[PDB]
Short mmCIF file of C-alpha atoms (C1' of nucleotides) in Angstrom, two decimals:
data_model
loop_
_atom_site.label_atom_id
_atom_site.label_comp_id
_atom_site.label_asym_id
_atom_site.label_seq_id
_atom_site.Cartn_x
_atom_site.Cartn_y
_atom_site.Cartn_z
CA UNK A 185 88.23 -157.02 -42.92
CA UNK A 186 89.87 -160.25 -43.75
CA UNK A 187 89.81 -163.23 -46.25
CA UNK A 188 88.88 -166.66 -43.89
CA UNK A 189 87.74 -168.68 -46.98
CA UNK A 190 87.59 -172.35 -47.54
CA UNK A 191 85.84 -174.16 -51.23
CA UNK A 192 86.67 -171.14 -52.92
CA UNK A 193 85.45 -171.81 -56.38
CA UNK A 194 85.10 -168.26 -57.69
CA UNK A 195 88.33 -166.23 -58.86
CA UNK A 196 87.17 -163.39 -56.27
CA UNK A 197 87.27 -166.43 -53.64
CA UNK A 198 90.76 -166.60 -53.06
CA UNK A 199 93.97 -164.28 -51.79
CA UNK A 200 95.28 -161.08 -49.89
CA UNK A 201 93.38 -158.38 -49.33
CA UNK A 202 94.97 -156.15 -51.48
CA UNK A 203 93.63 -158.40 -54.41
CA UNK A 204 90.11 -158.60 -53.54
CA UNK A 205 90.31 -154.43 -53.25
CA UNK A 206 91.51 -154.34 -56.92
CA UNK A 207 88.85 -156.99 -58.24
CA UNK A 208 86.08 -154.69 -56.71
CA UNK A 209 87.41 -151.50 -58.38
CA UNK A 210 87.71 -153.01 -61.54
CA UNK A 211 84.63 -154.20 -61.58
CA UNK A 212 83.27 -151.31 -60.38
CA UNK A 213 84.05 -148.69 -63.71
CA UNK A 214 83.29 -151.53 -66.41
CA UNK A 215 80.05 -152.45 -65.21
CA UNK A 216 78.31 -149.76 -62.61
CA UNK A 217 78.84 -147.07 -65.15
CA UNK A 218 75.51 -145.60 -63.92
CA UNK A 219 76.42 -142.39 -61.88
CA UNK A 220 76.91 -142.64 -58.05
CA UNK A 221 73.89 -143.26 -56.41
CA UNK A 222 75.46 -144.20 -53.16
CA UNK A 223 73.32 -147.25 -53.32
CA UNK A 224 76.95 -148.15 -51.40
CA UNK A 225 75.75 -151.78 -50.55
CA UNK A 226 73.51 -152.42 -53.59
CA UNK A 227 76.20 -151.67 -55.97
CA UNK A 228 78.30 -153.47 -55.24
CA UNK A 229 76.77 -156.43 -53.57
CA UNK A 230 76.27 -157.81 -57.05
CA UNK A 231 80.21 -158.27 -58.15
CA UNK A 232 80.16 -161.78 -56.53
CA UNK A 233 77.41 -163.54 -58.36
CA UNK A 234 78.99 -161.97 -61.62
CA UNK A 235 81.97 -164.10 -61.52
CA UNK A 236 80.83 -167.40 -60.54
CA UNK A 237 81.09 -168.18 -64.10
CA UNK A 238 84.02 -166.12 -64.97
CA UNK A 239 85.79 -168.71 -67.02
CA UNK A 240 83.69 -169.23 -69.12
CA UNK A 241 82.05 -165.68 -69.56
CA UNK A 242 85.07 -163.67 -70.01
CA UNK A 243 85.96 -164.84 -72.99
CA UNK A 244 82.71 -164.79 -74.74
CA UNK A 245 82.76 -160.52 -73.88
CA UNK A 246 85.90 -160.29 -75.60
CA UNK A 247 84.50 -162.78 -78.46
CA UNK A 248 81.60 -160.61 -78.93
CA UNK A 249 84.16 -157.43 -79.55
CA UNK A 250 86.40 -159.23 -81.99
CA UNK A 251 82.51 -159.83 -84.33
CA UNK A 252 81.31 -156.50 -84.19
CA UNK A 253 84.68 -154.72 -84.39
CA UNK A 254 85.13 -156.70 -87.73
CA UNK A 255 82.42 -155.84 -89.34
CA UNK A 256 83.10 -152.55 -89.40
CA UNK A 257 86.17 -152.49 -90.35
CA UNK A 258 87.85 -150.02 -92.76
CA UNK A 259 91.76 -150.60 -93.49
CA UNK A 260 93.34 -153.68 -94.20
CA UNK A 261 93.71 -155.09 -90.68
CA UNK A 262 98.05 -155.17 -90.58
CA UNK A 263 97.99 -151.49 -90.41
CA UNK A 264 94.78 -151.45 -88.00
CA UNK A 265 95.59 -150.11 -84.27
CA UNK A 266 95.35 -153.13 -81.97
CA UNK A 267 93.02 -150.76 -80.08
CA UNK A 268 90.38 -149.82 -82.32
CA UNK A 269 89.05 -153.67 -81.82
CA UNK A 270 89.55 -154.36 -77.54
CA UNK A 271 89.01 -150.95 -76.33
CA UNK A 272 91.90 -150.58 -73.78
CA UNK A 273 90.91 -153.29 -71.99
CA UNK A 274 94.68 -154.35 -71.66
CA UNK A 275 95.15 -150.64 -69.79
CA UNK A 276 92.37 -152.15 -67.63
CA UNK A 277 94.74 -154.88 -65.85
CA UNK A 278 97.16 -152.08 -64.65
CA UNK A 279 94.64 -151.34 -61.72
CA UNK A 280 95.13 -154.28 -59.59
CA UNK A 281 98.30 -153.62 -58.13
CA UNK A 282 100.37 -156.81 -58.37
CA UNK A 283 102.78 -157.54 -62.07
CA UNK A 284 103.16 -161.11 -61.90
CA UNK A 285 100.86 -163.55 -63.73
CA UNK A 286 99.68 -165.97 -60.68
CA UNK A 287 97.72 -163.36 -58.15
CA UNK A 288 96.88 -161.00 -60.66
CA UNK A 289 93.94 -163.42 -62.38
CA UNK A 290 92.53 -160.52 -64.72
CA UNK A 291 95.94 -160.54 -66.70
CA UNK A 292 95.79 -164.17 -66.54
CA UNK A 293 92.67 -164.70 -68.12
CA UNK A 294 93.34 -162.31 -70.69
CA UNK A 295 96.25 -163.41 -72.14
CA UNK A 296 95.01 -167.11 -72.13
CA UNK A 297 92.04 -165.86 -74.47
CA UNK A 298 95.04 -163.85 -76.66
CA UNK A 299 97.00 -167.02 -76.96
CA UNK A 300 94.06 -169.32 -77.72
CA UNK A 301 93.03 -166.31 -80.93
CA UNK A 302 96.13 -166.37 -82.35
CA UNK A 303 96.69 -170.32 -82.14
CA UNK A 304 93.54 -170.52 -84.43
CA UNK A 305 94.66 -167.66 -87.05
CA UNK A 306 98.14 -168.71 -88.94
CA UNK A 307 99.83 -166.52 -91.38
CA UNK A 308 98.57 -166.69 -94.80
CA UNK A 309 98.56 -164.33 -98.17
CA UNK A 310 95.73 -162.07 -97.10
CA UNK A 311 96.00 -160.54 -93.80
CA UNK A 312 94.12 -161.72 -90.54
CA UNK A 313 93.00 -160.91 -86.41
CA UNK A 314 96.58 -161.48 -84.88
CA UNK A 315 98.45 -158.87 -87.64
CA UNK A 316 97.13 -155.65 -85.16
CA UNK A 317 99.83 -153.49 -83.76
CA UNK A 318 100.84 -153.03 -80.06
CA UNK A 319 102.63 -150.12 -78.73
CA UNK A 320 105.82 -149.90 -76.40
CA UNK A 321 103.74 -149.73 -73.40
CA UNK A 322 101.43 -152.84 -74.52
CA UNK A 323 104.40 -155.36 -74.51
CA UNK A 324 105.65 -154.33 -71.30
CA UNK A 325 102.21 -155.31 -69.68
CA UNK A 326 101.66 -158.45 -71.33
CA UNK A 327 105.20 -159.10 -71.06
CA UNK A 328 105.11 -158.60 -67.40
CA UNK A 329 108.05 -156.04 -67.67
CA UNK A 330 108.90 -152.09 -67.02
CA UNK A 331 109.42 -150.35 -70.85
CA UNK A 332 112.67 -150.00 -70.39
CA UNK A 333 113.20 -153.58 -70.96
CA UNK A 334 110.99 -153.55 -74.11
CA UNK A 335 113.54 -151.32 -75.26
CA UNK A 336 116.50 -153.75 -74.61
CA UNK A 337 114.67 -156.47 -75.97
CA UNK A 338 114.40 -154.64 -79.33
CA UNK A 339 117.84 -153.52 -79.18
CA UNK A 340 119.07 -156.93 -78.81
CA UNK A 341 117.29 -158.30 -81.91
CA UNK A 342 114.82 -160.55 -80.05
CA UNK A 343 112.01 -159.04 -82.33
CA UNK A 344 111.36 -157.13 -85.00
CA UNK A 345 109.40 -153.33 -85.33
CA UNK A 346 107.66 -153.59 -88.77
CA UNK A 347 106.70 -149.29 -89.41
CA UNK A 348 109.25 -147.09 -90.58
CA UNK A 349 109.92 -144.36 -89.12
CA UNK A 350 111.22 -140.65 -90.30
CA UNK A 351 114.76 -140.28 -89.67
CA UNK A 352 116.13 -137.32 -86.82
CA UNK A 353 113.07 -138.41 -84.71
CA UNK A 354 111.91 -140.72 -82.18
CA UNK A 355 109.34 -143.52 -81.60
CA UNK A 356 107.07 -142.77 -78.76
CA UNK A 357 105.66 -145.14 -76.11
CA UNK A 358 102.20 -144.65 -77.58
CA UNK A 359 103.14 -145.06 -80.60
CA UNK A 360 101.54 -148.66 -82.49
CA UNK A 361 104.55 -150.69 -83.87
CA UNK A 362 104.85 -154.57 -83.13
CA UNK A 363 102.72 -157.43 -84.13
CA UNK A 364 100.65 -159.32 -82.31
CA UNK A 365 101.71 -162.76 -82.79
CA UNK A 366 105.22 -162.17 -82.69
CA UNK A 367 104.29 -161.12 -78.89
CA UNK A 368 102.14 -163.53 -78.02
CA UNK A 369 104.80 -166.07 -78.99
CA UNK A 370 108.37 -164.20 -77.73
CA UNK A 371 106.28 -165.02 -73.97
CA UNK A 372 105.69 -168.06 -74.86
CA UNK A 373 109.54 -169.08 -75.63
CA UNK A 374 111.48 -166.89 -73.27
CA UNK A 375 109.34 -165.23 -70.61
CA UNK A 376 108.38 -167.98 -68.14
CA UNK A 377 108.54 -167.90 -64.67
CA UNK A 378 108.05 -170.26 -61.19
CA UNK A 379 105.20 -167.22 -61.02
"C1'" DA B 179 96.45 -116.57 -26.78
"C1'" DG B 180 91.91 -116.87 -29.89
"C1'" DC B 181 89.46 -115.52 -34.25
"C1'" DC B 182 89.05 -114.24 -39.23
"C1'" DA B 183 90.56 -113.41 -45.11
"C1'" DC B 184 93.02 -114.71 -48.30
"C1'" DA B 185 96.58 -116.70 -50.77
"C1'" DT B 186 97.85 -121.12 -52.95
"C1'" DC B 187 97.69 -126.34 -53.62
"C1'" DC B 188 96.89 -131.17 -55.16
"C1'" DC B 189 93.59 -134.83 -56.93
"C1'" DG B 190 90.21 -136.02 -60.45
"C1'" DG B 191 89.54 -134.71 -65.25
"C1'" DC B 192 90.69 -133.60 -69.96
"C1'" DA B 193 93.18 -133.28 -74.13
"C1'" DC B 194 97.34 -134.31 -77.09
"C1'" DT B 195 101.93 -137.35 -79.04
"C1'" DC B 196 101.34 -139.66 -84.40
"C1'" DG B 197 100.89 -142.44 -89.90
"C1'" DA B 198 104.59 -143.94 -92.81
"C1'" DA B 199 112.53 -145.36 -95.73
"C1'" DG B 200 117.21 -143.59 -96.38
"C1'" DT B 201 120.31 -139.53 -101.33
"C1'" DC B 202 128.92 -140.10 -99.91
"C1'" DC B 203 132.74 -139.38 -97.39
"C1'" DC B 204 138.57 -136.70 -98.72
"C1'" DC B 205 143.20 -134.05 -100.73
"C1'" DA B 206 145.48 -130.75 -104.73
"C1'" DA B 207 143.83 -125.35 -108.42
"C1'" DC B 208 150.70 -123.13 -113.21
"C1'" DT B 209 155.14 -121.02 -114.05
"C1'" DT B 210 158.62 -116.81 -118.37
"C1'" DG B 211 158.24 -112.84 -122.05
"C1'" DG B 212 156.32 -108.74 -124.92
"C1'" DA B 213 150.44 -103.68 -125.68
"C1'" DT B 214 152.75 -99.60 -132.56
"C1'" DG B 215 153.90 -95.60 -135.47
"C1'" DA B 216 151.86 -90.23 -138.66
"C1'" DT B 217 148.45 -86.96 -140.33
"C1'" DT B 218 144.04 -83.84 -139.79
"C1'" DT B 219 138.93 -81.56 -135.54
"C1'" DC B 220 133.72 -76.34 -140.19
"C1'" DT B 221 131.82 -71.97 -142.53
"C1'" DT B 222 126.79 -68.09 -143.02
"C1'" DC B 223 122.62 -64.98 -140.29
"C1'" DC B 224 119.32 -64.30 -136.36
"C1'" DA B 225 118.52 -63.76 -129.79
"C1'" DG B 226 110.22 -60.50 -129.14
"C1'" DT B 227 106.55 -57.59 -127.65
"C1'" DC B 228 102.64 -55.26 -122.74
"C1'" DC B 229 100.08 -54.85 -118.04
"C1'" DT B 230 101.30 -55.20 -112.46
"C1'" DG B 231 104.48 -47.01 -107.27
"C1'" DG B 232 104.46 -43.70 -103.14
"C1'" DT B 233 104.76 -39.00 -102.24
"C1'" DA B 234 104.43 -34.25 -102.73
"C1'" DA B 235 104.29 -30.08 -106.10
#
DNA sequence: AGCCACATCCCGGCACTCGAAGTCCCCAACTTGGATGATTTCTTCCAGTCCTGGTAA
């Protein structure tokens, strides 16, 4: 009904309403995957214990993935989807509302944990975690942008697409084409904001 | 003006894109002069047989 708090700690502690909406639907589909119950108040009631240690529990779920996802893996990992190891959950930040990096804290989180896993993989003769392809519609939300600028940063030469395509076609949105680390460190270089 | 049957309608849901290099453009295509004469084209003999009318003196 309104926000009123003071020694907010917790990442669910702070902001406009619209915010703390978003946190509780996320939450809601990744971890209360049990059918409805209406157990309305008991549900729910437990998303605010759960991230009292979201800094430091975040990453180790998305650690765990990166383990088990390698272990069965069965193509050389530069032509591997970068979906087949983190599930979507980059899809997953789309439901809270906002686009900018400072209110939207799921996005924020995320992409610190992306920089931090390529910063500990370089390039080398055998390929490595950081090699996995993104789609069109992958930059754009990790590059804070609508698609259509993807497509006028590519068209400018600000980064390269590494599968070639048949000619008299097209490359879909969906389709997997640009490396990880060349992503994660265009944002880094060009991208920044007072945001 | 109040009550009832039947049309559709929009959200939540579901499933697909889909592997995976490109194989050269352009403009022209021939004019003149003649096609042969002299000769001849076969002859002997033969060419089946039997069955399958109606009507009135």
């Amino acid at each position: 009904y309104g926000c009123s708090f003071e020694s907010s700690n917790p990442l669910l502690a702070i902001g406009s309403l619209s915010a703390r909406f978003g946190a509780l639907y996320w939450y809601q589909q990744r971890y209360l995957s049990d059918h409805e119950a209406v157990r309305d108040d008991r549900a729910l009631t437990k998303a605010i214990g759960h991230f009292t240690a979201w800094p430091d529990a975040f990453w180790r779920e998305l650690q765990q993935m990166v383990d088990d996802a390698l272990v069965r893996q069965t193509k050389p990992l530069n032509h591997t989807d970068f979906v087949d190891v983190f599930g979507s959950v980059v899809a997953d930040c789309r439901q809270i509302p906002m686009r900018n990096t400072g209110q939207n804290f799921i996005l924020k989180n995320l992409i610190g944990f992306l920089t931090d896993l390529v910063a500990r993989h370089p390039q080398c003769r055998v390929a490595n975690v950081g090699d996995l392809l993104l789609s069109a519609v992958d930059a754009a939300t990790l590059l804070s942008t609508s698609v259509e600028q993807v497509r006028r940063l590519h068209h400018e030469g600000f980064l390269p697409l590494s599968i070639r395509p048949a000619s008299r076609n097209t490359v879909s949105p969906h389709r997997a084409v640009f490396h990880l680390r060349h992503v994660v460190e265009l944002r880094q270089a060009r991208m920044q904001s007072h945001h």
